[PDB]
Amino acid sequence: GPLGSQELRLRVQGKEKHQMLEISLSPDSPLKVLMSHYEEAMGLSGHKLSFFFDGTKLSGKELPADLGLESGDLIEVWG
């Protein structure tokens, strides 16, 4: 389909220096998938977190192409 099939390798960084996840995100996965994986990795389910890509706050409904994500990009997590 129009999204193609190139996996996006991303790093996700929270407020603690050790809060780092690397994730391979499928182009057909909404950003909520990344948000859930981050929460699980870091033991933060239920926490009120705000995720940003290059300053844009994520709802989790975005697809990577909505944001223009590419491998090697970073997602920042506040909270």
Q: What does the model show?
A:
The chain is α+β, with helices and mostly antiparallel strands. It has one domain: Ubiquitin-like (UB roll) (Roll), CATH 3.10.20.90. 20% of the residues lie in helices and 29% in strands. The chain has helices at residues 31-42, 64-67, and strands at 8-13, 20-25, 50-53, 56-57, 74-78. Strands 2-1-5-3-4 form a five-stranded mixed β-sheet, with helices on one face. The longest helix has 12 residues, at 31-42. The termini are far apart. It is classed as transcription. Keywords: ubiquitin fold, Coiled coil, Cytoplasm, Methylation. The assembly is monomeric.
* Envelope shape: globular
Strand and helix order: EEHEEHE
CATH architecture assignment name: Roll
Number of strands: 5
Task: Assign the CATH topology.
Answer: Ubiquitin-like (UB roll)
Subcellular location: Nucleus; Cytoplasm
Protein name: NFATC2-interacting protein
Domain Ubiquitin-like: 8-79
Subunit structure: Interacts with NFATC2, TRAF1, TRAF2 and PRMT1. Interacts with UBE2I/UBC9.
List the helices and strands and how they pair.
Blueprint: E1 8-13, E2 20-25, H1 31-42, E3 50-53, E4 56-57, H2 64-67, E5 74-78
Tell me briefly what this model is:
The protein contains two helices and five strands, in the order E-E-H-E-E-H-E. With 79 residues, it is of the alpha+beta class. Strand 1 and strand 2 (20-25) form a beta hairpin.
Main attributes?
alpha+beta; Ubiquitin-like (UB roll); 5 strands; globular
